Short mmCIF file of C-alpha atoms and ligand atoms in Angstrom, two decimals:
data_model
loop_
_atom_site.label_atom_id
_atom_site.label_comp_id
_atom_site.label_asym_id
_atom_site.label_seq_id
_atom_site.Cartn_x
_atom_site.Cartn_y
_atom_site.Cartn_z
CA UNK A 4 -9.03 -17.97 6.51
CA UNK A 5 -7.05 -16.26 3.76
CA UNK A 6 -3.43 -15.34 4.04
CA UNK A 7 -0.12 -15.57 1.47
CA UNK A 8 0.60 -19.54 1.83
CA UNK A 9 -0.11 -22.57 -0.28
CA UNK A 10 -3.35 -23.45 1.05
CA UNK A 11 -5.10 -19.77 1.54
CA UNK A 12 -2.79 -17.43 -0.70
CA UNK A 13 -4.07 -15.05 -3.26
CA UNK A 14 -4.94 -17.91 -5.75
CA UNK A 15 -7.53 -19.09 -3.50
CA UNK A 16 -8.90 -15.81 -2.39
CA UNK A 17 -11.59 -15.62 -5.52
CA UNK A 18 -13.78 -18.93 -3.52
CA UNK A 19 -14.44 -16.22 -0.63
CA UNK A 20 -14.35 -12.93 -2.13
CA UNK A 21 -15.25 -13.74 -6.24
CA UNK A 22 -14.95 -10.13 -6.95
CA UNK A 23 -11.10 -11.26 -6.71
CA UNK A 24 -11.57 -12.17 -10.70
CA UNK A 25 -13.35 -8.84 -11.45
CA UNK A 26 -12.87 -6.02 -14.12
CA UNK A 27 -10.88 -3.90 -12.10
CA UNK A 28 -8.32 -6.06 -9.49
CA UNK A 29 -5.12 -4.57 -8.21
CA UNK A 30 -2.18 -4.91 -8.29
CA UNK A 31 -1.43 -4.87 -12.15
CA UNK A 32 1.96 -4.52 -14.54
CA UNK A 33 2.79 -0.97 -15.41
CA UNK A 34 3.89 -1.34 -19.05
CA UNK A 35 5.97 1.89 -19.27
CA UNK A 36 5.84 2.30 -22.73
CA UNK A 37 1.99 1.32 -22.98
CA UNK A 38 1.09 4.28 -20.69
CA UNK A 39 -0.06 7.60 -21.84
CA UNK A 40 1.00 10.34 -21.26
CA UNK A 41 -1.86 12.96 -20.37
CA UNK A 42 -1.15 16.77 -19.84
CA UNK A 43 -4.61 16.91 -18.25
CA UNK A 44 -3.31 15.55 -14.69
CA UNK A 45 -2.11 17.40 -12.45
CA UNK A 46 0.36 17.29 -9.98
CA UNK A 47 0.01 15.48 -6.62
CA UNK A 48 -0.79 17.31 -3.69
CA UNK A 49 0.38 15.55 -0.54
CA UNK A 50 -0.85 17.62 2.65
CA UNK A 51 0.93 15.70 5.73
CA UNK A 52 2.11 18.71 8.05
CA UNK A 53 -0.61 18.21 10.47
CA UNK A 54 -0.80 14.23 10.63
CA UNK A 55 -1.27 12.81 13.48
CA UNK A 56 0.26 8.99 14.01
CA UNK A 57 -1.62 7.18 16.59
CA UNK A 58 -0.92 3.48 16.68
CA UNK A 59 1.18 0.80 14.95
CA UNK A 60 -1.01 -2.86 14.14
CA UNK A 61 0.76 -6.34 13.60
CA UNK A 62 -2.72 -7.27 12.35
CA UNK A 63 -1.73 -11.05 10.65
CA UNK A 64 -0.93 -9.78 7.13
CA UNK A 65 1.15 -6.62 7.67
CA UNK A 66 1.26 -3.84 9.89
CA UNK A 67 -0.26 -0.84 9.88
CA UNK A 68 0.44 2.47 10.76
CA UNK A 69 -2.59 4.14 11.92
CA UNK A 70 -3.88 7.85 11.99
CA UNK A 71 -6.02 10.17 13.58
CA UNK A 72 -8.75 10.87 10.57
CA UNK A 73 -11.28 12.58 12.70
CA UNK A 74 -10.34 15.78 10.79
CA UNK A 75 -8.53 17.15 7.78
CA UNK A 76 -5.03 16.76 8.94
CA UNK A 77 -3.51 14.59 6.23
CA UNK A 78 -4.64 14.78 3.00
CA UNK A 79 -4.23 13.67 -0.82
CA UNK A 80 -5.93 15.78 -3.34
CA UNK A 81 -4.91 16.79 -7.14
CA UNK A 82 -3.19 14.59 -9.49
CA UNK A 83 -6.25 11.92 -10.58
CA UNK A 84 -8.48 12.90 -7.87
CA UNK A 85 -11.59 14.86 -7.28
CA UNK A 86 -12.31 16.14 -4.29
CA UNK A 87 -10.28 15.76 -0.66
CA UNK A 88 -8.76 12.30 0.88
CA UNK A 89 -8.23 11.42 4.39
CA UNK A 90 -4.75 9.56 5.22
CA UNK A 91 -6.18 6.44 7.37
CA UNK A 92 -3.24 4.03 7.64
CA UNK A 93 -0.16 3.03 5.84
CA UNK A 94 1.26 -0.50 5.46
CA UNK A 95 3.68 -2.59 3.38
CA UNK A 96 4.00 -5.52 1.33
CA UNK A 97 7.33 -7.35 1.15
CA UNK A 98 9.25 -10.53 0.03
CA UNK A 99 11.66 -13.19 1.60
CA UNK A 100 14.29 -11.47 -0.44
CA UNK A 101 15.08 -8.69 -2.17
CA UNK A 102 13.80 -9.50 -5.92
CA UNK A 103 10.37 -9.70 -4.63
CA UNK A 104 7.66 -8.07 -2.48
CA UNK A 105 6.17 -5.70 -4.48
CA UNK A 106 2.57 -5.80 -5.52
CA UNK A 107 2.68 -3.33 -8.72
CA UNK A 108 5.69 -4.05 -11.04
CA UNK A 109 6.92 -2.10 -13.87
CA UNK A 110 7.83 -3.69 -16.87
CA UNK A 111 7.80 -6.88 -14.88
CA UNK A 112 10.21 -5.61 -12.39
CA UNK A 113 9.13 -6.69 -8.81
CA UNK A 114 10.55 -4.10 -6.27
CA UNK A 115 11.96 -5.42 -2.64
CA UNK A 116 8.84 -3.62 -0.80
CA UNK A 117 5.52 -1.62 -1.79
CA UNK A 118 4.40 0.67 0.74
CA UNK A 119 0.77 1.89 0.58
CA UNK A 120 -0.72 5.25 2.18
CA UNK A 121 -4.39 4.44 2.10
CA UNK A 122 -6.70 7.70 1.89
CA UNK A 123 -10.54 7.70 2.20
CA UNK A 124 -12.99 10.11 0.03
CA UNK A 125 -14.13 12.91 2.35
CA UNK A 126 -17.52 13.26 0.32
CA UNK A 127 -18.46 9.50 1.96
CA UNK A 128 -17.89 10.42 5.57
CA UNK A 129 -16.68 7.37 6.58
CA UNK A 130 -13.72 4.43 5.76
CA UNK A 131 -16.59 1.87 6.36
CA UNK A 132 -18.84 4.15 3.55
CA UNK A 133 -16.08 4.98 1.16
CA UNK A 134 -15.13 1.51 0.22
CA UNK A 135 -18.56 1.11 -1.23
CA UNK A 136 -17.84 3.44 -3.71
CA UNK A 137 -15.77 3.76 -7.12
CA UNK A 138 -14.37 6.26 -5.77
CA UNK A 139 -14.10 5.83 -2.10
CA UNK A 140 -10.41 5.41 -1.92
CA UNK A 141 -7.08 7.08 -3.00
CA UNK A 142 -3.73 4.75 -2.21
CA UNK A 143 -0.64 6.55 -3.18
CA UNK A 144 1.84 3.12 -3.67
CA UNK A 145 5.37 3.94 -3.29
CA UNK A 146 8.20 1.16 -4.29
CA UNK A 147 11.32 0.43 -1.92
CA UNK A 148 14.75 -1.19 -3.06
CA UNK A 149 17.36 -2.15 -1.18
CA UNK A 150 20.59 0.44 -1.24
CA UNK A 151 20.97 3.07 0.99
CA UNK A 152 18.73 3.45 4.83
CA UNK A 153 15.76 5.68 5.00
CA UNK A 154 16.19 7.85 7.76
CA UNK A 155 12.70 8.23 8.12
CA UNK A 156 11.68 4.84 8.08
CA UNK A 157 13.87 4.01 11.21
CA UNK A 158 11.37 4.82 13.94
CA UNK A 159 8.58 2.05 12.21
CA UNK A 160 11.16 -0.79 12.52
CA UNK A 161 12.36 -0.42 15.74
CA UNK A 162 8.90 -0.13 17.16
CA UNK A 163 8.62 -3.87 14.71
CA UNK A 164 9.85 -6.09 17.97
CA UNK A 165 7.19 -5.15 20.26
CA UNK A 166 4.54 -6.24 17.48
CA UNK A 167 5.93 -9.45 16.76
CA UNK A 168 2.52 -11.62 16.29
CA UNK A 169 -0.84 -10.97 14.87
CA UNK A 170 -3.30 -8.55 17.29
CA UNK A 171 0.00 -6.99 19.21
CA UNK A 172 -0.27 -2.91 18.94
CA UNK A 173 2.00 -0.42 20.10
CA UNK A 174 1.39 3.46 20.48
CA UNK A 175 2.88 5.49 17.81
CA UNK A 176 2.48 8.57 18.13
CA UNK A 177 4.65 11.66 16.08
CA UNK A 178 5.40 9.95 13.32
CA UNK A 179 5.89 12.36 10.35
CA UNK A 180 4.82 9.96 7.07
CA UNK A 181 6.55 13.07 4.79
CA UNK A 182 9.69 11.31 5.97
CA UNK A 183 8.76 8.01 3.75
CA UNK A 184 8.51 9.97 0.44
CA UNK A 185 10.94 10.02 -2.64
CA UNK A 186 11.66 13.31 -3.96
CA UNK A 187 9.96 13.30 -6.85
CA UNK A 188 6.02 13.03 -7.21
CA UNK A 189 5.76 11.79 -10.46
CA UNK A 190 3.01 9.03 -10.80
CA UNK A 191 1.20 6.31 -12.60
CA UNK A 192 -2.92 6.75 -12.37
CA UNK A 193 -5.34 3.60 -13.14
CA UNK A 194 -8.75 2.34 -11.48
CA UNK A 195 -8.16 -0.24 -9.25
CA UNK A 196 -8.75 -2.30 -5.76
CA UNK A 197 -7.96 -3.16 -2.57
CA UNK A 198 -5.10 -5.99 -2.71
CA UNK A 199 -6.40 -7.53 0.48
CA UNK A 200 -9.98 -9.28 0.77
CA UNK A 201 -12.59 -8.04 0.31
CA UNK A 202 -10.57 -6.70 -2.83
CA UNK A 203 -13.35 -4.15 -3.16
CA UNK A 204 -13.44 -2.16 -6.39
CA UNK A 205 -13.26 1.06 -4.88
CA UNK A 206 -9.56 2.42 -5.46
CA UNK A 207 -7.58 5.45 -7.43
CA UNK A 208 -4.14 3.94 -7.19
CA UNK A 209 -1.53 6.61 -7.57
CA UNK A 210 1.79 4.71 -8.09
CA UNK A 211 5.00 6.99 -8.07
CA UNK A 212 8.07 6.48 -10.15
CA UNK A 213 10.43 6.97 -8.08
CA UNK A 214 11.34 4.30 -5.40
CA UNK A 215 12.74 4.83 -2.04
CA UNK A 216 16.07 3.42 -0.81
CA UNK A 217 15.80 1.36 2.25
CA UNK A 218 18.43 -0.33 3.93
CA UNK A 219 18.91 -4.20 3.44
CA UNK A 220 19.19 -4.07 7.82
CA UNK A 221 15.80 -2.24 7.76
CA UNK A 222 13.95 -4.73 5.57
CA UNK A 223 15.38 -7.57 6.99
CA UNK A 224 13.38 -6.68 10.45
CA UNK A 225 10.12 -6.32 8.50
CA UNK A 226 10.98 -10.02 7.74
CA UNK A 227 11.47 -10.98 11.23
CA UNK A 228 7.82 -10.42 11.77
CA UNK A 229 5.50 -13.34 12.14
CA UNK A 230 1.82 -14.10 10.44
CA UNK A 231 0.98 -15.85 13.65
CA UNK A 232 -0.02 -14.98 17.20
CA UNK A 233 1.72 -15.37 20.30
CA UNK A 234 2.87 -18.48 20.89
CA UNK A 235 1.85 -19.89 17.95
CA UNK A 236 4.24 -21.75 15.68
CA UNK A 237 6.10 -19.49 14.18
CA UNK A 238 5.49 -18.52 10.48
CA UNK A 239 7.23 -15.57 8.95
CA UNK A 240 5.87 -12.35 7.31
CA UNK A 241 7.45 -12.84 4.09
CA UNK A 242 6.10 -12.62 0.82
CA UNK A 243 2.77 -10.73 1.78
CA UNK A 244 2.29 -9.27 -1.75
CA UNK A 245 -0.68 -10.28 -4.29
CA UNK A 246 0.73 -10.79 -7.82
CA UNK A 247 -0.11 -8.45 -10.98
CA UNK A 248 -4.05 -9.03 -11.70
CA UNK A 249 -5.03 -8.73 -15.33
CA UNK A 250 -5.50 -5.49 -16.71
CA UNK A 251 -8.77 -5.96 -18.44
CA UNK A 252 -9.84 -3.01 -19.83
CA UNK A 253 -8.48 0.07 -18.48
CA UNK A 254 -5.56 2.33 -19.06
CA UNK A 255 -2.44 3.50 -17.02
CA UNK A 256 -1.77 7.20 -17.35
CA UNK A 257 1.31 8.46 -16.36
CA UNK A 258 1.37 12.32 -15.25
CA UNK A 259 5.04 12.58 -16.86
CA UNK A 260 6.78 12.05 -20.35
ZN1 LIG B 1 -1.45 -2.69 0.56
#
């Protein structure tokens, strides 16, 4: 089964899922100065007030923090998008150590972490449904470095020790996602996919410029999680981040000059 070592890591993902070498594969490079520019997008609307947290995953490659999307209580619309996204989940991505973890660089610069908020096209009904599609999904990628703590992100790792191994869950409940935001919205648009298997072709990624500060105490307990399940030797989850997929032929807009 696939995972981030030597033997199942992203370079041998393509032998199960060979859409892992297709025409539109995420993450990529954002070459700043290669972007355009383009007037035409608009500005982000992020809609959390009424989102309801539910559960937190250790699921074997990150965790996830899961939502109530039974109804429109959380969602992305505006910027690149058409129509009305559903907030599922968020996760992360991180490294061993600080000069690695993200999944999108810019101008080769890997980030410490890459959190993802993964949305789901409205018009498809369903998560299961809207993956299928070109437009199924919206991800809204937002980079962490290491300086300051993020108040916000305090509640998600100290809830981290009670999902140590792969299949633990916790309730989660009241978590406000708004709290995990930089101040600015500003944002990189491109046509993308899932960075997991099946690496279906199905995303809008929505990267923003600015990255959040976390502290270097709050990223080292995302490292003292473990790929494995209970009991099982201990591996760490470090380094759970797919490198920059070639960008074939498409084009990074940026909504900003
Ligand atoms: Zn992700």
């Amino acid at each position: 089964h696939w995972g981030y070592g030597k033997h199942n890591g992203p370079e041998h993902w393509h032998k199960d899922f060979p859409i892992a070498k297709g025409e539109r594969q995420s993450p990529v490079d954002i070459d700043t100065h290669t972007a355009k520019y383009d007037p035409s997008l608009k500005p982000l609307s992020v809609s959390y007030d009424q989102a309801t947290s539910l559960r937190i995953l250790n699921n074997g490659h990150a965790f996830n923090v899961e939502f109530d999307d039974s109804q429109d209580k959380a969602v992305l619309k505006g910027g690149p998008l058409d129509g009305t996204y559903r907030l599922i989940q968020f996760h992360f991505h991180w490294g061993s150590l600080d000069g690695q973890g993200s999944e999108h660089t810019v101008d080769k610069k890997k980030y410490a972490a890459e959190l993802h908020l993964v949305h789901w096209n409205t018009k498809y009904g369903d998560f299961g449904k809207a993956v299928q599609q070109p437009d199924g999904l919206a991800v809204l990628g937002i980079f962490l470095k290491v300086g300051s703590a993020k108040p916000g992100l305090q509640k998600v790792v100290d809830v981290l020790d009670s999902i140590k191994t792969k299949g633990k869950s916790a309730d989660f409940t009241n978590f406000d996602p708004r709290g995990l935001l930089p101040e600015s919205l500003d944002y990189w648009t491109y046509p993308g996919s899932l960075t997991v298997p099946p690496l279906l072709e199905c995303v809008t990624w929505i990267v923003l410029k600015e990255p959040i500060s976390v502290s270097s105490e709050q990223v080292l307990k995302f490292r003292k999680l473990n790929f494995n399940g209970e009991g099982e030797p201990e591996e760490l989850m470090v380094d759970n981040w797919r490198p920059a997929q070639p960008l074939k032929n498409r084009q990074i807009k940026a909504s900003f000059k």
